[PDB]
Design an enzyme around this catalytic site. Structure first.
Site, PDB file in Angstrom:
ATOM      1  CG  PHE A   1      48.490  55.545  68.454  1.00  0.00           C
ATOM      2  CD1 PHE A   1      49.262  55.074  69.528  1.00  0.00           C
ATOM      3  CD2 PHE A   1      47.838  54.618  67.644  1.00  0.00           C
ATOM      4  CE1 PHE A   1      49.379  53.705  69.788  1.00  0.00           C
ATOM      5  CE2 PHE A   1      47.961  53.224  67.894  1.00  0.00           C
ATOM      6  CZ  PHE A   1      48.729  52.771  68.964  1.00  0.00           C
TER       7      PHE A   1
ATOM      8  CG  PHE B   1      48.923  57.389  63.465  1.00  0.00           C
ATOM      9  CD1 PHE B   1      48.525  56.178  64.047  1.00  0.00           C
ATOM     10  CD2 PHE B   1      50.273  57.736  63.503  1.00  0.00           C
ATOM     11  CE1 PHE B   1      49.448  55.348  64.678  1.00  0.00           C
ATOM     12  CE2 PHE B   1      51.206  56.907  64.119  1.00  0.00           C
ATOM     13  CZ  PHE B   1      50.792  55.708  64.713  1.00  0.00           C
TER      14      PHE B   1
ATOM     15  CB  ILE C   1      41.840  50.704  60.788  1.00  0.00           C
ATOM     16  CG1 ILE C   1      41.485  52.134  60.370  1.00  0.00           C
ATOM     17  CG2 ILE C   1      40.635  49.789  60.569  1.00  0.00           C
ATOM     18  CD1 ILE C   1      40.664  52.896  61.399  1.00  0.00           C
ATOM     19  CB  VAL C   2      42.257  47.351  65.651  1.00  0.00           C
ATOM     20  CG1 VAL C   2      42.731  46.015  66.245  1.00  0.00           C
ATOM     21  CG2 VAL C   2      43.090  48.518  66.170  1.00  0.00           C
TER      22      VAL C   2
ATOM     23  CB  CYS D   1      36.608  46.910  59.186  1.00  0.00           C
ATOM     24  SG  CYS D   1      37.909  48.170  59.211  1.00  0.00           S
TER      25      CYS D   1
ATOM     26  CE1 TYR E   1      48.167  43.892  62.668  1.00  0.00           C
ATOM     27  CE2 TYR E   1      47.959  41.493  62.711  1.00  0.00           C
ATOM     28  CZ  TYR E   1      47.609  42.742  63.204  1.00  0.00           C
ATOM     29  OH  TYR E   1      46.714  42.855  64.246  1.00  0.00           O
TER      30      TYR E   1
HETATM   31  C1  LIG Z   1      35.119  44.353  53.991  1.00  0.00           C
HETATM   32  C2  LIG Z   1      33.811  44.590  54.747  1.00  0.00           C
HETATM   33  C3  LIG Z   1      34.065  45.182  56.174  1.00  0.00           C
HETATM   34  C4  LIG Z   1      33.007  45.629  53.882  1.00  0.00           C
HETATM   35  O1  LIG Z   1      31.711  45.742  54.415  1.00  0.00           O
HETATM   36  P1  LIG Z   1      30.510  45.919  53.393  1.00  0.00           P
HETATM   37  O2  LIG Z   1      30.348  44.718  52.537  1.00  0.00           O
HETATM   38  O3  LIG Z   1      29.248  46.246  54.158  1.00  0.00           O
HETATM   39  O4  LIG Z   1      30.899  47.174  52.474  1.00  0.00           O
HETATM   40  P2  LIG Z   1      30.085  48.019  51.337  1.00  0.00           P
HETATM   41  O5  LIG Z   1      28.691  47.468  51.174  1.00  0.00           O
HETATM   42  O6  LIG Z   1      30.021  49.428  51.773  1.00  0.00           O
HETATM   43  O7  LIG Z   1      31.042  47.851  50.027  1.00  0.00           O
HETATM   44  C5  LIG Z   1      31.335  49.114  49.413  1.00  0.00           C
HETATM   45  C6  LIG Z   1      31.993  48.785  48.081  1.00  0.00           C
HETATM   46  O8  LIG Z   1      33.299  48.290  48.439  1.00  0.00           O
HETATM   47  C7  LIG Z   1      33.627  47.312  47.479  1.00  0.00           C
HETATM   48  N1  LIG Z   1      34.434  46.290  48.064  1.00  0.00           N
HETATM   49  C8  LIG Z   1      35.679  45.970  47.693  1.00  0.00           C
HETATM   50  N2  LIG Z   1      36.108  44.936  48.416  1.00  0.00           N
HETATM   51  C9  LIG Z   1      35.132  44.586  49.264  1.00  0.00           C
HETATM   52  C10 LIG Z   1      35.061  43.587  50.213  1.00  0.00           C
HETATM   53  N3  LIG Z   1      36.117  42.774  50.418  1.00  0.00           N
HETATM   54  N4  LIG Z   1      33.929  43.436  50.926  1.00  0.00           N
HETATM   55  C11 LIG Z   1      32.904  44.294  50.666  1.00  0.00           C
HETATM   56  N5  LIG Z   1      32.928  45.278  49.772  1.00  0.00           N
HETATM   57  C12 LIG Z   1      34.055  45.446  49.037  1.00  0.00           C
HETATM   58  C13 LIG Z   1      32.355  46.657  46.928  1.00  0.00           C
HETATM   59  O9  LIG Z   1      32.361  46.661  45.495  1.00  0.00           O
HETATM   60  C14 LIG Z   1      31.277  47.599  47.455  1.00  0.00           C
HETATM   61  O10 LIG Z   1      30.360  47.968  46.405  1.00  0.00           O
HETATM   62  P3  LIG Z   1      30.571  49.246  45.451  1.00  0.00           P
HETATM   63  O11 LIG Z   1      32.018  49.395  45.048  1.00  0.00           O
HETATM   64  O12 LIG Z   1      29.756  49.072  44.208  1.00  0.00           O
HETATM   65  O13 LIG Z   1      30.116  50.513  46.154  1.00  0.00           O
HETATM   66  C15 LIG Z   1      32.967  43.237  54.838  1.00  0.00           C
HETATM   67  O14 LIG Z   1      32.863  42.714  53.522  1.00  0.00           O
HETATM   68  C16 LIG Z   1      33.605  42.250  55.792  1.00  0.00           C
HETATM   69  O15 LIG Z   1      33.237  42.231  56.968  1.00  0.00           O
HETATM   70  N6  LIG Z   1      34.551  41.432  55.327  1.00  0.00           N
HETATM   71  C17 LIG Z   1      35.262  40.442  56.145  1.00  0.00           C
HETATM   72  C18 LIG Z   1      36.202  41.118  57.133  1.00  0.00           C
HETATM   73  C19 LIG Z   1      37.334  41.915  56.492  1.00  0.00           C
HETATM   74  O16 LIG Z   1      37.870  41.509  55.483  1.00  0.00           O
HETATM   75  N7  LIG Z   1      37.709  43.062  57.086  1.00  0.00           N
HETATM   76  C20 LIG Z   1      38.808  43.923  56.566  1.00  0.00           C
HETATM   77  C21 LIG Z   1      40.112  43.541  57.220  1.00  0.00           C
HETATM   78  S1  LIG Z   1      40.035  43.937  59.037  1.00  0.00           S
HETATM   79  C22 LIG Z   1      41.222  45.241  59.277  1.00  0.00           C
HETATM   80  O17 LIG Z   1      40.840  46.344  59.518  1.00  0.00           O
HETATM   81  C23 LIG Z   1      42.784  44.966  59.175  1.00  0.00           C
HETATM   82  C24 LIG Z   1      43.442  43.835  59.956  1.00  0.00           C
HETATM   83  O18 LIG Z   1      42.732  42.912  60.480  1.00  0.00           O
HETATM   84  O19 LIG Z   1      44.698  43.824  60.059  1.00  0.00           O
END
Ligand SMILES: CC(C)(COP(=O)(O)OP(=O)(O)OC[C@H]1O[C@@H](n2cnc3c(N)ncnc32)[C@H](O)[C@@H]1OP(=O)(O)O)[C@@H](O)C(=O)NCCC(=O)NCCSC(=O)CC(=O)O
Ligand SMILES: CC(C)(COP(=O)(O)OP(=O)(O)OC[C@H]1O[C@@H](n2cnc3c(N)ncnc32)[C@H](O)[C@@H]1OP(=O)(O)O)[C@@H](O)C(=O)NCCC(=O)NCCSC(=O)CC(=O)O
Ligand SMILES: CC(C)(COP(=O)(O)OP(=O)(O)OC[C@H]1O[C@@H](n2cnc3c(N)ncnc32)[C@H](O)[C@@H]1OP(=O)(O)O)[C@@H](O)C(=O)NCCC(=O)NCCSC(=O)CC(=O)O
Ligand SMILES: CC(C)(COP(=O)(O)OP(=O)(O)OC[C@H]1O[C@@H](n2cnc3c(N)ncnc32)[C@H](O)[C@@H]1OP(=O)(O)O)[C@@H](O)C(=O)NCCC(=O)NCCSC(=O)CC(=O)O
Ligand SMILES: CC(C)(COP(=O)(O)OP(=O)(O)OC[C@H]1O[C@@H](n2cnc3c(N)ncnc32)[C@H](O)[C@@H]1OP(=O)(O)O)[C@@H](O)C(=O)NCCC(=O)NCCSC(=O)CC(=O)O
Ligand SMILES: CC(C)(COP(=O)(O)OP(=O)(O)OC[C@H]1O[C@@H](n2cnc3c(N)ncnc32)[C@H](O)[C@@H]1OP(=O)(O)O)[C@@H](O)C(=O)NCCC(=O)NCCSC(=O)CC(=O)O
Ligand SMILES: CC(C)(COP(=O)(O)OP(=O)(O)OC[C@H]1O[C@@H](n2cnc3c(N)ncnc32)[C@H](O)[C@@H]1OP(=O)(O)O)[C@@H](O)C(=O)NCCC(=O)NCCSC(=O)CC(=O)O
Ligand SMILES: CC(C)(COP(=O)(O)OP(=O)(O)OC[C@H]1O[C@@H](n2cnc3c(N)ncnc32)[C@H](O)[C@@H]1OP(=O)(O)O)[C@@H](O)C(=O)NCCC(=O)NCCSC(=O)CC(=O)O
Lengths: 164, 163, 161, 164, 162, 162, 162, 162
Positions: free
Chosen positions: E68, E73, E76-77, E79, E145
């Protein structure tokens, strides 16, 4: 009186004279093939990929042969043949087929395929069609409409003799 | 005299060319009395047909008319002729040799032809055989059928120079 | 609600695009041992077409197929109806619409590989193990698949109207 | 050093880098297939209907696979296959065959056909090639270049396996 | 094998298109409570971009986002990282590449709505529950949301993020 | 009869122009204590659009609206269904179509100043008196008719409305 | 005397340009303690327009204004009537014509900084010191002079002003 | 011989490019806590401009700035005079020239962040720590610097600054 032969079709443009001849051909085909649905006849006659050899007597359509050339496949499908009822048994059918044969030699397509029903198979025999199909099944299975019930027949043309 | 080979044809894009096809139609027709003149002219002047013209001192004295079917993987031999006073000197073989070499360069490696009883010997001497490896499904309806003549086939070796 | 059938394919419109994605989603969710990326490649491949079944703007099933006019048959690649909408005749209407479409286009033979989870559905659509298309006609054109059963359906031709 | 795979060829419209790579590939094919006349390799590698998968190390061609896709028939012909003698027996030939498979997976072509000498048949066997030819003769005769004496071989691909 | 990052979006070639499908698949599978059709509509929306994480030609994660510029800003939609590739730093690597991308486009605030299962990830990427961007700037532009937590990240353009 | 919906407005052809005149008549007849000149100005104003409801070629109702994409909302200006087609769901299908159309343009907030005869209808369509859009985004872009009730509808973009 | 009203502005025609000089003269003579250079800059600024009062071809007064459509208001910059033509209703007709003109451009708020000599006139034109437009919408767009009173006028698009 | 020129990389001849490099050099040497690649990105940004101070064809100082006409202010980005031209009034002349420039462009507010080493220069140029421009108008548009002080200058368009 005056007899004319013309190969026409609805190209993707059409003379008003041509458009009326095409309706005339659809009329003749429809009347002489009463169980062939008229909308289907119209769609083929007016389809760009189909051509029709019109038989014109004093500016009026009295007969035709509608066909689709398959130059990729090396043959032509005969779709409709018809002479109006009060001009039949006068040789018009034979001059039509001959003119179609001449037209195809000059375009190096040397094989006709058609479905012949019980009412007109005798006419196709006299134009040299036989039931021995030399064209490979694989060359036409996906291209010609299958008129199951009617007899598939084939004519091989000789490009060295004159037909007209 | 000087002898030259040239592949020509009736393009859709010449006069030296046009006169040469007329000459070839002339020679083809005189050496093939049973091929009607109009039929020879129709094929010789058709744009998808090419003719390997053999020429001695600006004068057409032989040729092979042929039709390439590259989607099918073969060339059809349409007409062969050497003018009468120039036969039995090896011109027929040099024409076939040249036609072979040309087809190597366009990666077409199969010739098909029909031969009557009087020409079958000549084709046998150019490496044609009665055994046809090309399938019917690939040539029927693309080559001119000749009932009552023998279908002959030549296979080319692309690792071999023919000329 | 409203029911639509559409034969679609990758050229397109945004509407067609999101339908292809919905189809790739439905196929992938109902065939979870297919690789997701392979289903997507085929659904978006421009010589494949998919018959889409739409309920209220939504993809709820479809049939992805490959026509072989030079061989007189069509290959059926994916058939799926989403779980919530199964066992309602939707699979039957899809195959019936697929049949009509092919009669209009002069292709009277279906070939497909059926597995043990769905062979009975294909049987009820008139498929059998007796393959009358010569092997020389389909070898190398359809994706042969050891471990599944090649089946055939023969259609009756029809004069339109 | 650095390794690169590129599918290259002499197409409709040329690149200076591509041209030199094509010369390089023709050099390597010639030097490793002596029985192939160098001018024959040249016109095939530069023919537009032919592509070649080039193995580049440090900007220099060290290997390649020349191939002719026949999508209307369902197969690809492998025409030449070579790794420069300095780089052999290091898995480059396998990596080349693997990339070629992946490339063909993405283009929905799932059969390879090739003629192999007694000298090379072992390498194709280890790439999963078989003497059991499941494509009908009618499908490939006259399209693949016959090498009478050599063995016709076929490789079937699985479009569900990631080859790269 | 070979990791690559690409910012892509609809607007259109087969490789990009199959990648967008791949992202739609990964988002939809990792966010089961998001309708597949909604994910697909946003991923293929031309004002939406996606940063795609490519391992050996396959999509294994990404961040879908909506810039936007008139508002200052990015939203983030979605991840996600595919299930078997998670907890390896890929999620952190994706966000860092997204921050680096936004520095060069002079957008220095991220906004997202996170449910309770995602807050921890965003916290570790430097997001906060303290929202400095005024409500008058983001309401009606980002999709709100009800029930999730609005979170904000401020970026330093003087810092190398990748 | 055959029912169509067309989003139209001034920028042009005669069928549209006669539709715009019909909308003007229907709005004006259903809202007679509103100056006819004022309704006509708004319906033919290029920054205004009307969703027209067509029954057998004739205008039987519509919703005239003003998109403010910069302010992140649309203003509902006039809603009318002709007297003999009321209490049949056309008013609801009109709002539904208007909702679906705005989701495609990422405008998710409707605002309107409803009078005492209309509040029930807007409530059925999910409007509310709790305004989330801050005053600074709408004040002066829409006119605050004294004695009229400001009402807001929030659209859910994950949901099909038509 | 033949009276005329014309909305004019710079960026050309010979008559328009001489009218603008005449407006710069009238504004400057009637506002002697504002620098004539600053008046000329504004009168000829292309984002500024002036509604000119013409009597028998001669400029006898006008209102210079700055439309801010993005902000939903217009700033009144100068008002003047030549001294010989004051207290005859001209200033009232000018302001009425300005109101009508903004009604058909969907701008319903005026803002101005009145000095002590002109507050009475603005009160008669329906201006108030009660400012409903929030500060964030006008601050830094209109110029705030120390010692001037911010006044506001709310327009009604259903009232015919001329 | 002294010269003042407003320049920028607006999508520039060789003379302007070398002046921009000259200004990137000077800013970099006088603000060593700014990464030199950051200064370069901003100085060469097409939306940024710099008021160059030239002495005998050579760059000796400037003010890099970013005009936000939509927001009604301008951000002071870098201010520097080379070390041996300082305490001569060059920095005051620069700010005055920048003020004069902004009045003729109907922008009347400067915003900037100053650390303790620099606050006193800006106070002598008329900047205040009392910010009138609301947060909603500048946050996420100007570059925040935590730990620095936000300062503001209000300009007067009836005052000749040069
Ligand atoms: C959340 C993720 C994108 C993170 O990806 P990764 O696992 O590769 O991340 P990473 O390896 O770099 O993790 C870095 C550090 O973050 C911390 N960490 C905390 N919470 C975590 C979590 N829920 N998942 C993964 N890591 C997490 C961990 O301790 C980790 O180790 P350390 O701390 O030791 O370094 C994935 O787990 C995922 O796809 N989850 C399901 C989808 C999801 O929940 N997406 C977010 C909402 S979507 C969005 O954007 C909003 C919306 O939909 O409205
Ligand atoms: C078939 C016709 C077009 C033939 O035209 P003509 O009547 O002018 O025939 P003609 O004068 O040239 O006669 C040539 C020779 O064929 C013989 N003959 C034998 N059976 C015949 C038959 N069923 N119809 C016509 N002629 C027939 C005649 O005795 C004659 O024999 P001799 O010379 O020895 O004295 C016509 O009969 C007709 O319009 N019929 C209705 C339409 C139809 O059936 N069309 C074909 C449908 S099957 C098909 O493929 C679809 C289609 O084409 O429409
Ligand atoms: C056939 C020819 C083109 C060959 O011409 P040349 O005489 O120049 O050939 P040549 O000198 O190289 O002869 C090579 C050897 O072929 C051997 N030979 C055996 N039978 C032969 C035969 N029927 N015709 C020509 N040569 C023949 C001879 O022994 C000869 O000598 P040695 O053995 O000692 O080396 C010509 O003779 C000719 O024009 N014939 C008439 C036209 C014709 O028949 N054309 C073919 C059909 S047309 C066609 O292609 C098919 C079709 O349209 O149906
Ligand atoms: C197979 C389906 C598309 C069928 O769809 P529907 O559920 O809508 O079928 P329907 O309601 O029309 O039922 C029609 C008749 O088939 C019968 N029937 C018998 N076995 C069945 C079976 N295994 N699955 C579904 N129906 C079956 C039903 O009892 C019914 O009988 P009656 O009406 O007489 O009482 C669905 O089951 C599905 O999506 N399954 C998961 C995906 C799948 O397995 N696809 C096929 C993969 S093999 C293949 O070739 C590739 C591919 O297709 O993907
Ligand atoms: C055949 C090659 C391309 C293979 O390349 P590489 O040397 O890199 O092989 P590689 O490292 O990947 O190992 C493959 C495995 O196959 C086994 N192997 C068995 N027989 C082999 C053979 N004749 N050549 C190479 N490898 C062979 C090896 O032991 C090896 O290890 P392991 O056993 O442990 O797994 C090359 O050796 C080469 O360029 N040879 C010269 C040209 C040639 O003959 N090309 C093929 C013919 S072209 C042809 O005739 C077909 C065509 O025309 O296209
Ligand atoms: C308001 C209407 C457009 C509604 O159109 P329809 O009659 O087609 O409505 P509908 O059939 O789809 O929905 C009917 C449902 O709404 C409930 N309902 C409650 N109050 C209602 C009311 N005042 N008008 C219509 N419906 C009302 C009913 O109980 C019913 O409940 P259930 O849920 O059980 O079905 C029409 O009545 C109309 O044209 N009225 C006069 C014009 C008008 O007042 N317009 C709005 C003015 S203010 C504004 O901002 C717009 C404007 O200026 O015109
Ligand atoms: C302010 C003016 C533009 C007003 O023009 P007019 O003289 O044509 O005003 P008008 O005849 O239409 O009067 C409308 C009503 O406003 C009332 N009124 C109250 N205070 C006034 C004031 N300070 N100036 C003018 N009128 C004023 C008068 O009684 C009048 O009558 P009633 O109330 O009986 O109806 C002009 O006087 C002028 O040019 N003044 C000098 C420049 C100036 O001050 N400009 C604005 C600066 S900011
Ligand atoms: C600050 C300067 C641009 C000022 O330039 P000049 O030296 O030419 O100033 P000048 O001669 O016109 O005026 C000098 C007057 O300012 C007063 N003064 C008070 N504090 C001062 C300060 N911190 N720096 C300079 N002058 C200061 C002196 O007492 C003196 O008093 P009197 O008035 O009586 O004569 C320069 O000193 C400089 O280049 N400094 C290094 C770079 C820098 O710090 N720039 C500002 C931050 S960059 C920025 O914009 C901030 C950010 O992005 O974070």
């Amino acid at each position: 009186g005056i007899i004319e032969f013309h190969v026409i079709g609805n190209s993707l443009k059409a003379n008003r004279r041509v458009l009326l001849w095409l309706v005339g051909l659809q009329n003749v085909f429809s009347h002489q093939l009463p169980r062939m649905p008229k909308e289907y006849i119209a769609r083929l006659v007016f389809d760009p990929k189909h051509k029709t050899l019109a038989l014109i007597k004093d500016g009026r359509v009295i007969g035709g042969i509608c066909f689709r050339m398959f130059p990729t496949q090396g043959f032509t499908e005969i779709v409709f043949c018809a002479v109006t009822s009060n001009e039949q048994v006068k040789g018009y059918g034979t001059h039509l087929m001959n003119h179609l044969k001449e037209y195809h030699i000059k375009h190096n397509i040397l094989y006709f395929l058609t479905y012949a029903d019980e009412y007109a198979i005798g006419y196709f025999k006299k134009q040299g069609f036989s039931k021995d199909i030399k064209v490979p099944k694989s060359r036409y299975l996906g291209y010609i409409k299958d008129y199951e019930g009617a007899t598939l027949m084939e004519c091989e043309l000789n490009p060295r003799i004159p037909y007209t």
